[PDB]
Amino acid sequence: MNTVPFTSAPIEVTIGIDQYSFNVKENQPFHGIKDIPIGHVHVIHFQHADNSSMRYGYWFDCRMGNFYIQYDPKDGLYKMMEERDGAKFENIVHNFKERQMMVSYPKIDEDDTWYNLTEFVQMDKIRKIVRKDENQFSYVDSSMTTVQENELSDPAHSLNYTVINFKSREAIRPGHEMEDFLDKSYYLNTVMLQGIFKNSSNYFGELQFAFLNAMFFGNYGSSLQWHAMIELICSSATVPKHMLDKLDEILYYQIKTLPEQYSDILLNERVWNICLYSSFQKNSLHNTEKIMENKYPELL
Amino acid sequence: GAMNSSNYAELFNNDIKLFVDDTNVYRVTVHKTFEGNVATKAINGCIFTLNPKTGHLFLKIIHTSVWAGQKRLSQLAKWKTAEEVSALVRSLPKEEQPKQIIVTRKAMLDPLEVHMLDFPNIAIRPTELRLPFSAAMSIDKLSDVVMKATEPQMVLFNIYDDWLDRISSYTAFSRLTLLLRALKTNEESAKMILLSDPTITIKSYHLWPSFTDEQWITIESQMRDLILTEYGRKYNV
Numbered sequence: 238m239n240t241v242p243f244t245s246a247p248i249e250v251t252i253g254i255d256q257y258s259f260n261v262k263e264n265q266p267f268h269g270i271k272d273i274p275i276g277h278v279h280v281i282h283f284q285h286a287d288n289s290s291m292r293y294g295y296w297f298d299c300r301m302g303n304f305y306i307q308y309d310p311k312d313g314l315y316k317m318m319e320e321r322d323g324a325k326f327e328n329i330v331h332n333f334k335e336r337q338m339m340v341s342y343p344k345i346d347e348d349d350t351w352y353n354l355t356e357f358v359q360m361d362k363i364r365k366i367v368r369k370d371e372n373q374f375s376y377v378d379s380s381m382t383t384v385q386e387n388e389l390s391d392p393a394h395s396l397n398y399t400v401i402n403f404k405s406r407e408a409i410r411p412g413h414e415m416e417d418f419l420d421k422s423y424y425l426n427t428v429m430l431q432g433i434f435k436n437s438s439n440y441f442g443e444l445q446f447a448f449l450n451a452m453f454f455g456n457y458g459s460s461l462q463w464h465a466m467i468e469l470i471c472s473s474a475t476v477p478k479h480m481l482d483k484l485d486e487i488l489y490y491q492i493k494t495l496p497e498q499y500s501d502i503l504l505n506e507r508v509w510n511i512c513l514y515s516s517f518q519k520n521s522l523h524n525t526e527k528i529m530e531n532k533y534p535e536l537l
Numbered sequence: 538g539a540m541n542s543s544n545y546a547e548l549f550n551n552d553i554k555l556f557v558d559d560t561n562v563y564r565v566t567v568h569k570t571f572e573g574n575v576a577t578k579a580i581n582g583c584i585f586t587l588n589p590k591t592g593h594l595f596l597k598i599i600h601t602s603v604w605a606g607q608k609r610l611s612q613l614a615k616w617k618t619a620e621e622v623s624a625l626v627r628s629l630p631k632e633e634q635p636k637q638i639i640v641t642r643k644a645m646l647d648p649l650e651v652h653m654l655d656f657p658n659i660a661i662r663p664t665e666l667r668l669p670f671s672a673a674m675s676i677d678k679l680s681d682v683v684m685k686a687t688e689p690q691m692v693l694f695n696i697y698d699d700w701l702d703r704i705s706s707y708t709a710f711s712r713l714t715l716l717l718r719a720l721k722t723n724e725e726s727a728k729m730i731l732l733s734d735p736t737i738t739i740k741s742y743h744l745w746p747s748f749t750d751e752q753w754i755t756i757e758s759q760m761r762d763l764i765l766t767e768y769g770r771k772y773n774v
């Protein structure tokens with residue numbers, strides 16, 4: 238198990254870590270989160286109690302380094318940093334544990350939720366979507382725009398998701414206009430899976446990452462990406478059977494985890510009705526359809 | 538954006554544009570089978586592609602053979618239309634290519650947009666006008682060339698005959714839409730009006746009769762009366 242120590246908590250803030258949320262009061266004696274499960278990416282995120290504008294946070298993997306949080310009073314936010322001196326870090330963490338100033342990550346043992354939301358997410362792929370190569374962790378916030386959003390303005394602070402656009406020359410083979418617009422299989426399997434992502438696992442990793450940035454930061458461009466990647470599969474008549482079964486599992490856990498009170502902004506009515514009821518794969522998402530119908534029948 | 542009554546004069550400016558109407562591309566008669574089921578038989582159709590400024594009509598005849606062995610014909614008809622319009626644009630010299638294509642039915646937007654991806658500077662636009670271009674097959678010489686065709690064929694017309702020698706494009710389009718609206722609401726009456734006076738003839742190289750300016754005012758008034766008459770017959774007013 239691993240630890241993200243905090244130098245201090247000078248400002249009141251809600252801290253979340255993966256799907257969990259908790260409160261820290263102004264100058265409360267808080268010195269981090271411990272017992273973080275090894276083997277998964279994680280995200281630590283923040284919403285200041287005095288300005289909920291800008292949720293922000295850091296994707297990281299404790300196998301890749303020793304990371305801690307320190308508030309910066311000039312830039313006004315909790316910043317992640319790497320500690321390169323490993324003896325110093327263990328010593329710091331051991332002392333904060335002995336003083337029991339660290340909150341305990343509440344991983345119930347029956348629970349596979351986080352695994353199921355991050356199965357295909359790999360820190361190395363996150364670091365290509367979020368370019369900031371001098372760090373091993375990745376910063377994301379509410380307002381960051383995507384490469385595709387900037388085409389339609391700072392590029393250094395962008396989310397470089399794979400651009401999907403159903404009315405583009407990349408999506409449509411000359412001479413197969415009607416075929417390719419109504420059945421996206423060429424675009425899914427040849428352009429995206431074989432050409433760009435190389436395999437279904439990298440495709441699913443980006444899809445899951447996009448969902449999680451939408452949910453945790455309200456990042457609208459990430460929500461657009463998540464829905465686009467779903468619709469591309471559902472709108473393809475030819476999809477490997479293993480991808481369809483996995484997609485159903487992926488979406489099921491995403492819908493299960495979504496805050497009920499956020500369904501109105503994070504779920505696109507048109508895409509979901511199309512995917513569940515009109516698309517080629519309308520009959521291939523049994524678990525996702527069952528949870529959607531019992532949890533959000535209003536949308537449908 | 539969408540074309541409507543406010544930007545109506547844009548049709549007659551110096552930016553090349555085409556209206557595309559697909560309502561006569563896929564045409565069927567519905568009939569009973571020996572066993573008492575219903576079946577369709579296709580007949581020849583046409584794409585109606587019109588420059589409203591010049592009157593140039595690019596009439597692409599759709600021969601029934603293009604439907605042979607195809608499924609979901611009404612959906613295919615929109616993509617076939619889009620393919621033919623795209624091929625027409627590519628065939629035109631650069632300086633004759635349209636800057637805008639206005640489709641009379643919104644279901645044509647995506648098919649045409651996808652077929653025109655190679656032309657990102659050509660705007661594809663819908664319209665809120667209810668234009669009577671479906672009635673083009675009520676023009677005898679257009680109907681005749683469509684029905685006689687034995688293979689795909691493009692035929693070029695000027696749908697304004699020689700009117701632009703005497704009137705503006707705006708007035709020429711208003712006349713055409715009034716003629717076509719009348720022929721759509723009561724074809725028999727409209728044709729009776731247009732031909733009642735046998736001394737007024739249709740030149741061999743024209744589609745409509747050789748009316749004087751004065752006789753066109755009379756004719757246009759008769760077409761309005763016809764439209765208003767039918768509107769009262771319909772609604773009992």
Ligand SMILES: O=C(O)[C@@H](c1ccc(Cl)cc1)N1CCOCC1
Nearest residue numbers: 254257258259270340341342343
């Ligand atoms: O939800 C939980 O299990 C705990 C919790 C979440 C995250 C961490 Cl790291 C520690 C404890 N909450 C604490 C505040 O509110 C009660 C529940």
